[PDB]
Amino acid sequence: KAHPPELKKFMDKKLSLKLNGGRHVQGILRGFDPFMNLVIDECVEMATSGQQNNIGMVVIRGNSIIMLEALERV
Amino acid sequence: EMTPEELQKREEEEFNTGPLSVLTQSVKNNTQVLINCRNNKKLLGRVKAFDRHCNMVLENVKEMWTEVSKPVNKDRYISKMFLRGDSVIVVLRNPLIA
Amino acid sequence: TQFLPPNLLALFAPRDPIPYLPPLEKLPHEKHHNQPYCGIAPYIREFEDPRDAPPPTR
Amino acid sequence: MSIGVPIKVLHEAEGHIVTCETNTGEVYRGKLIEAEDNMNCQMSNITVTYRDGRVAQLEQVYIRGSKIRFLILPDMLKNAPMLK
Amino acid sequence: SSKMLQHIDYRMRCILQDGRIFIGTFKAFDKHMNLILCDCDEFRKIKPKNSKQAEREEKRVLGLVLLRGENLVSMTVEGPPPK
Amino acid sequence: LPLNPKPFLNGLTGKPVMVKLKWGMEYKGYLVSVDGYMNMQLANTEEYIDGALSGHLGEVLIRCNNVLYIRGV
Amino acid sequence: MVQPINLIFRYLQNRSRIQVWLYEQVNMRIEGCIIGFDEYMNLVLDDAEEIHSKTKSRKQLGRIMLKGDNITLLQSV
Amino acid sequence: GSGSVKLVRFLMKLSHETVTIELKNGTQVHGTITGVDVSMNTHLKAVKMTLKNREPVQLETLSIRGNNIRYFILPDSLPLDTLLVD
Amino acid sequence: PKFYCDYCDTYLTHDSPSVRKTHCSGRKHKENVKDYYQKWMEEQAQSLIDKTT
RNA sequence: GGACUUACCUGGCAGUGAGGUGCACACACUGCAUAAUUUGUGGUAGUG
RNA sequence: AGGUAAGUCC
Ligand SMILES: [K+]
Ligand SMILES: [Mg+2]
Ligand SMILES: [Mg+2]
Ligand SMILES: [Mg+2]
Ligand SMILES: [Mg+2]
Ligand SMILES: [Mg+2]
Ligand SMILES: [Mg+2]
Ligand SMILES: [Mg+2]
Ligand SMILES: [Mg+2]
Ligand SMILES: [Zn+2]
């Protein structure tokens, strides 16, 4: 009943992701599932301070992803 | 489901033993219940019926809440309602204080 | 309807982009909760005396 | 059964210009490359319009359906077969 | 479903969760109450920050709109189908 | 030992537990039962508002959606 | 491709210490070791902590189950 | 007794009953139910809608997407035991 | 699970993303579409009824 | 246009219509799975 | 069962 999202196009691409709590994050998309949970790699926090921080190989819950933007050509 | 057979009265077993026993008992014994509701209002009343979502039909409810300066108490009486289950936070059976 | 003669495809033209208007509500994570959700401890005194309760119908 | 008229209409606008307001109150205007049955949308050549009024240009975006308020589709689509 | 079909092709005023109003010609719906509105116009009430000044109604034209069901609150009929 | 959520709770059933709600209140008491949606029935329950004890309640149903985390004693 | 479920399983095995960003709560995070989990993404966290961003001090919890609805993002150390 | 299987099945019986609904956004609706639906979507006629801190407004018809409902306030006389045998 | 193509007046007894895309990038389909909106331009012919007055 | 052949993509479960019985597949309606991330059981709380 | 694609006949 529940189909997977079409994010083959964005695989292994650097993305910038708008997230739930006014949080933004950026990194390389290594994988996904039908809830749109994402695996990001070499991911950077992009805190409001303007300061960026490196956490890598994160899991993002699909639920809390609003929009993603490709930084590199798809 | 884990129970794809068409008589999941596993529904009822849960009702009798599981956590919604709070309701099943309240209904049976006609005990008063206090519900903290997501409008942030307090409903104290009796439970005539309920369902999986904690949809409840209530009787003799007193809705109680706080407004403002210093905080003022407020209450209203509602004699029959249907409450939508999603809007339940917590239900509390009457602890028989005496 | 993507791949048509440009004669017909000119029908599926956007309307002009919409005027900006600011948002109506603040963002949910940045809204100020003046009386946040609160507990039921103060209210127990409201409950009936159990002697004064009605009897179990079944 | 399961598929419904308004989502069809969304898919009919694939390939054209759509505006899309997200839950956050941002607005994305651009070419709708593709849409899924959930309203998740990939778009190209987007003029985003942030809450404040400032705009930006974005190459490629993808938007979760669950986070969309509404879309503006091309008026021609009202003459689609389904809407009759 | 005839409760909804009853109003089809009528002009309907929809209240959204943020308090916008969409008025529009009601072309289609589904199990979610996603809507298709034609010639849809959006209205909104803007509060005066000073305690008493006249409130602004702000129209803004959208055209053909697909409203996600989740953001719908209510619909009432605004007017009869256009000719 | 990979210790998953259903077994974890089943563990704590019987034992005193503290449940923290998304809304910032917490309820302490003897976890009695749980279902597949993780609704919780508590007994001898008491209400802790902002970390420190608010009052003693009783037998309480907590609708699952409201819970943030649950923890032993 | 790395399935998000697998990399959670990777985190479990590694006994890595995971930090969770929360849904719609931006002041608190929670960190701990993932002993177990499920289909809903509920986590069992062995030595959980409450981290408050304004405070920059932590509240110790012990072993917790954190319901999945809350999770926004999973991080390491 | 105990819980019904589904309790919307009750609300669906309330045709021609006049009720007051409170919405999750503070709006109050008073009206006469023409139909209730499995998803608790609710149709009313002869409606007086009173948005939060606004003056009432009368309407010939109103439909409410059910998720928005916090509760129904029912007629004091409504025969519950009858209607609950389900 | 079923899908109805308004353009083709045909059914996909079991719908999927894959199947619907295959159908929609189909020879028969694309022609039916072209036809549908050409037929609509013929509508503009009905404008002449106004043209005559 | 129509018929067949091959390959590829797809396919939830149940009750009834449906009348010799059983199986398979389709259609119609009705349920269930379905209160667990993308709409139908709440971080849009009503908080002025 | 249906769609598509390639082929065979009408
Ligand atoms: K259902
Ligand atoms: Mg919702
Ligand atoms: Mg027969
Ligand atoms: Mg669901
Ligand atoms: Mg839900
Ligand atoms: Mg499920
Ligand atoms: Mg949800
Ligand atoms: Mg849901
Ligand atoms: Mg929901
Ligand atoms: Zn077709």
Numbering used by the authors:
A (entry chain G): 3 to 76
B (entry chain D): 10 to 77, 87 to 116
C (entry chain K): 2 to 59
D (entry chain A): 1 to 84
E (entry chain B): 6 to 88
F (entry chain F): 3 to 75
G (entry chain E): 14 to 90
H (entry chain C): -3 to 82
Excerpt from the publication:
Crystal structures of the two sub-structures of U1 snRNP. molecular details of 5′SS recognition by U1 snRNP. intricate network of interactions between the components of U1 snRNP. insights into the molecular mechanism of 5′SS selection.
5′-splice site RNA determined at 3.3 Å resolution. snRNA (SmKCm) construct replaces the 4-way junction with a kissing loop. contacts between U1 snRNP and a 5′SS RNA with the consensus sequence. However, U1-C makes no contacts with the RNA bases. sugar-phosphate backbone atoms but makes no contact with RNA bases. 16–23 of U1-70k are wedged between SmD3 and SmB. The path of the N-terminal peptide of U1-70k. central hole where it interacts with nucleotides preceding stem-loop IV. is found in the central hole (grey, Mg++; red, water).
